[PDB]
């Protein structure tokens, strides 16, 4: 039932991302010209341009937003082997702290949920995930890398757990994009035992054999279990019922090949009921659930 439209915006170079803030009034798009720019929807529904500035030497792939409670910051990664932050001063943005501790290309950057503070997770092609901290919301010019996680493989995408119930310990999902002839799990999950005060490997999905492009976590909204979508040759949705690391009851719920190609990106709604997936077939297919608790398509857009 989804109908399309066209957005009145003009760019020069190809852009690699789009990301709303928390309300849906500020997007942040990174262009192939190393130039990121921020739009701002107005009261009349139009989109204007507010800022733009070139980034570091590499090529930017990801730009993410932050919760409005902490101010207005964005984290962006590029092949410059560095991760950046940006704060509004009013509007001239300023660099605050370039988290440069990686010997490879930091593929992904993501922000931790609000309920625990200002953390951001990055891992590079070397296969080591880093977690950073801002233990003074006052000044953003000071960060600390507490935990380093060995992955014994590469990174493609990571995603946190939106769930904020006290029962659930913090969780993280690390992908891989290695097409080695051997077969190994390419998606793994880590937990955080407060007793050991460290991140421990919890569960891995052995059914994953091909390279993985993207991973996302469906928001909780008070549910009992968790919902996870993995980008592969086929879109797949897994649910992990809670039972050291907590044992997880894993069973598949969907497996979709209605693309005839390789899936690139996966996204979720605010509620966590509609999935939007994009692939090399040049179409965007949105999947929702039906009355029989069955996962089926709802619109194919191009």
């Amino acid at each position: 039932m989804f109908v399309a439209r066209s957005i009145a915006a003009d760019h020069k170079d190809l852009i690699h991302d789009v990301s709303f803030d928390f309300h849906g009034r500020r997007m942040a798009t990174c262009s192939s010209d190393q130039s990121v720019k921020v739009w701002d929807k107005s009261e009349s529904g139009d989109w204007h341009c507010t800022a733009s500035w070139k980034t570091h030497s590499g090529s930017v792939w990801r730009v993410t937003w932050a919760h409005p409670e902490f101010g207005q910051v964005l984290a962006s990664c590029s092949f410059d082997r560095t991760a950046a932050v940006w704060e509004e001063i009013v509007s001239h943005w300023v660099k605050r702290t370039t988290l440069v501790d990686s010997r490879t290309s930091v593929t992904d950057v993501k922000f931790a949920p609000k309920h625990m503070g200002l953390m951001l997770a990055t891992c590079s092609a070397d296969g080591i995930v880093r977690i950073y901290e801002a233990p003074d919301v006052m000044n953003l010019s000071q960060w600390s890398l507490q935990h380093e996680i060995s992955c014994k493989l590469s990174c493609s995408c990571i995603s946190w757990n939106p769930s904020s119930s006290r029962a659930h310990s913090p969780m993280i999902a690390v992908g891989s994009d290695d097409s080695s002839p051997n077969a190994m799990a390419k998606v793994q999950i880590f937990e955080y035992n407060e007793n050991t005060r460290k991140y421990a490997k919890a569960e891995t999905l052995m059914t994953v054999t091909d390279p993985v492009h993207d991973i996302a976590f469906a928001p909780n909204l008070g549910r009992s279990f968790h919902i996870l979508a993995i980008a592969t040759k086929d879109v797949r949705i897994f649910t992990l019922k809670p039972v050291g690391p907590t044992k997880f009851e894993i069973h598949i719920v969907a497996q979709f090949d209605n693309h005839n190609s390789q899936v690139w990106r996966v996204s979720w709604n605010i509620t966590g009921t509609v999935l939007a997936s994009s692939g090399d077939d040049g179409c965007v297919r949105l999947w929702k659930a039906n009355y029989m608790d069955n996962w089926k398509c709802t619109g194919i857009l191009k």
């Binding site: 852009i15 709303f20 798009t29």
Partner: protein, 744 residues
């Protein structure tokens, strides 16, 4: 080895190369050139004139030109149809031309003895104009677009960088792949080389070793070409593969993507030079499909159920149906619609929330009618908020009967509370369901009324009811007149016939009536397990007929079934206890609704359910969702509701101001502090000390405190509002910061 190409001057004009040359316009063919059987090498004229003019080299290796266009005064025909054979017979290998100077053109041949092989001849308007490389194999012949006296050649096992102005001047570099050697117009220093399923990439400035090496795919790569309207994009085609793999050369990692322009094997794929990244694939079955491969797509959702996706450079968006029909879209849209309609908040008559919820949903029909009943009874009255299970937990004094007496206060009173809550018995003690039946008949639910009467043992009244219903709006009287066969016979025609037809009926209520009439004595499991019939009526009938021991089985089994299935209609059985919480957890896990979860729980909850870690999470998450809506005032009203109906919730933790001499809080002379009576602060504008007295308005808004969180300068609300309306600096002299604009 057929391929495809378009007219270099006309985008719409395309050429299909086969055993016979075919020209088509963008497909409708223009002409069929079957005058060149057994084609080996094909070239096109760099110059515009003549239109649809080409150069062909067959196995004989002669330089012959053929054309398909219609020219009335073609300027150059002495070369049109001309033939230029070599000095010896070598098979056709390659052929090209220089767009810099169309007069000179170069061709490649197979191995003769010691005649020319890389022979360049001008078509005029006999012999080659420029020649080199005697007794050698020229796999590819090409011209450098930039330097008009430069070209790149490929020997049997080497590639040389020579020049026209000096024949002996050349730069030869050894390599294993010399196939598919080309340089993109944008990439002047990038060279190509293909070796079966493997591809070798080298830099012109570093033409000594392969700069980049690609994976050796199993099927050999057939055709490899650069993107004619993209930067750093190259595509390589293989044999009998539906999808052609490609690489990204814009890195300086190379992203590898493959696109299938058709579902069948295509001999060659050619991208139109004029079109913007549009590719055309040709198969042996004379089918051509133009597929323009797209790039990676990004996605981003929005809190207004809107999706924004970037496909290349342009930005697009998807909206939410906007049809006011079908399934009322996703739960988020219904949630926003209910919040905008002030849903759940209207608590003076409970049941109105079912229309306030929008469409007619049966699940949000049992909840609000049950919730209305519970509140209505307790106003007159653990009593109601306990469910049927607790209500009949200590049930005693039920007597069964072998045969119904054809044709309610005799039941135990606690067993009648269940009947009262199940909507049959009115508030009063009358055992006459008369008003309920009259309301049912007025509502038009004739079959439901007939079922209620049969349960109430008025066969003649039920027959009259069915006749009246069938008077207005034909099978109703048919069933009703058929119904009079009821008896206690062992093998009655009525009995066997109705036992057969009980599954033959369509209306569930009629089926239930048939099953009850044909039910064997003692066992009534046909009626009590009709999942197509209302839970309410079945529970009420079981309470009305079943005994003590045969109710504690049915109630428990039904409650477990409803809890596992997550049916909201079972709240009447579960009640507002931990069991009801588990049922609501299943409902939220299924549907994803938190208003129906938050407002239901807050409606009369004893202070044990509200303390659960689950019943608080739903409220907190609904409040956050309301924050995403930017529905601030709706959230404020919901907070009033929750606070007045849930003592455990502690309001927000904020700032209180403290004195400078006492050191303690001022929150409960007005100007004097209540701690030790030392002067309170004063407005920067009135210079009068603050204070507030801790229908007639006791303490207006204009006299409240207000202060800058960076200055700690404060004053009355009204004076500060006026001052910052016309000015923009901190009211106190010598202060500097711009107080208002910090937050706005």
């Amino acid at each position: 080895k057929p391929d495809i190409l378009w007219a270099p001057h006309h985008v719409d004009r395309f050429v299909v190369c086969d055993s016979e040359l075919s020209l088509y316009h963008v497909a409708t063919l223009l002409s069929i050139n079957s005058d060149t059987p057994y084609m080996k090498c094909v070239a096109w004229y760099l110059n515009y004139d003549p239109e649809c003019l080409l150069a062909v080299g067959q196995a004989n290796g002669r330089v012959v030109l053929t054309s398909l266009g219609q020219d009335h005064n073609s300027k150059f025909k002495d070369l049109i149809g001309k033939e230029f054979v070599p000095k010896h017979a070598r098979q056709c290998n390659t052929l090209a031309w220089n767009p810099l100077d169309s007069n000179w053109l170069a061709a490649g041949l197979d191995k003769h003895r010691a005649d020319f092989s890389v022979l360049i001849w001008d078509i005029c308007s006999t012999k080659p104009l420029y020649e080199l490389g005697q007794n050698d194999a020229c796999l590819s012949l090409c011209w450098l677009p930039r330097d008009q006296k430069l070209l790149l050649a490929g020997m049997h096992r080497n590639l040389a960088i020579f020049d026209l102005r000096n024949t002996s001047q050349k730069m030869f570099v050894n390599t294993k792949a010399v196939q598919g050697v080309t340089v993109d117009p944008y990439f002047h220093d990038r060279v190509a080389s293909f070796y079966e399923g493997q591809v070798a990439i080298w830099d012109l400035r570093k033409f000594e070793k392969p700069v980049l090496t690609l994976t050796e795919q199993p099927k050999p790569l057939t055709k490899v070409a650069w993107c004619p309207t993209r930067t750093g994009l190259l595509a390589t085609l293989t044999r009998d593969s539906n999808i052609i793999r490609l690489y990204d050369m814009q890195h300086t990692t190379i992203i590898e993507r493959s696109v299938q322009p058709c579902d069948n094997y295509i001999a060659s794929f050619a991208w139109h030079p004029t079109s913007q990244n549009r590719m055309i694939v040709v198969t042996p079955n004379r089918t051509m499909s133009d597929f323009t491969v797209f790039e990676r797509i990004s996605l981003a959702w929005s809190p207004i159920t809107s999706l924004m996706w970037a496909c290349g450079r342009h930005l697009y968006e998807c909206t939410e149906e906007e049809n006011d029909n079908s399934l009322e879209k996703d739960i988020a849209t219904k949630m926003r619609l209910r919040a905008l309609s002030r849903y759940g908040l209207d608590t003076e008559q409970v049941w109105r929330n079912h229309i306030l919820a929008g469409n007619e949903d049966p699940q949000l029909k049992s909840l609000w009618y049950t919730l209305h009943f519970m509140k209505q009874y307790t106003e007159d009255m653990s009593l109601v908020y306990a469910g049927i299970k607790s209500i009949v937990k200590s049930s005693l004094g039920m007597v069964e009967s072998s045969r119904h007496n054809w044709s309610i206060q005799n039941l135990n009173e606690e067993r009648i509370l269940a009947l009262q809550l199940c909507g049959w018995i009115k508030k009063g003690t009358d055992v006459d369901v008369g008003p309920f039946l009259n309301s049912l008949v007025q509502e038009g639910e004739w079959e439901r009324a007939a079922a209620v009467a049969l349960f109430n043992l008025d066969i003649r009244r039920a027959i009259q009811i069915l006749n009246e219903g069938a008077s207005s709006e034909l099978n109703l009287n048919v069933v009703a007149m058929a119904l009079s066969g009821y008896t206690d016979e062992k093998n009655s025609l009525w009995r066997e016939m109705c036992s057969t037809l009980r599954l033959q009926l369509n209306n569930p209520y009629l089926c239930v009536m048939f099953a009850f009439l044909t039910s064997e004595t003692g066992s009534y499991d046909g009626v009590l397990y009709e999942n197509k019939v209302a839970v309410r009526d079945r529970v009420a009938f079981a309470c009305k007929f079943l005994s003590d021991t045969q109710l504690n089985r049915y109630i428990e089994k039904l409650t477990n079934e409803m809890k596992e299935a997550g049916n909201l209609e079972g709240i009447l059985l579960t009640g507002l206890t931990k069991d009801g919480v588990d049922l609501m957890e299943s409902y939220v896990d299924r549907t994803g609704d938190v208003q129906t979860a938050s407002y239901c729980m807050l409606q009369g909850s004893p202070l044990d359910v509200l303390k659960d870690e689950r019943v608080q999470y739903w409220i907190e998450n609904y409040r956050n969702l309301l924050d995403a809506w930017r529905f601030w005032h709706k959230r404020a009203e919901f907070d009033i509701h929750r606070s007045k109906l849930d003592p455990s919730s502690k309001p927000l933790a904020q700032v209180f101001v403290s004195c400078n001499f006492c050191g303690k809080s001022i929150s409960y002379k007005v100007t004097s502090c209540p701690g030790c009576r030392k002067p309170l602060p004063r407005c920067a504008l009135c210079l009068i000390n603050m204070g507030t007295p801790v229908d007639k308005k006791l303490a207006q808004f204009n006299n409240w405190f207000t202060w800058c969180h960076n200055c700690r300068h404060g004053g009355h609300a009204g004076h500060m509002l006026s001052w910052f309306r016309d000015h923009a600096e901190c009211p106190v002299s010598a202060c500097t910061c711009k107080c208002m604009q910090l937050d706005t």
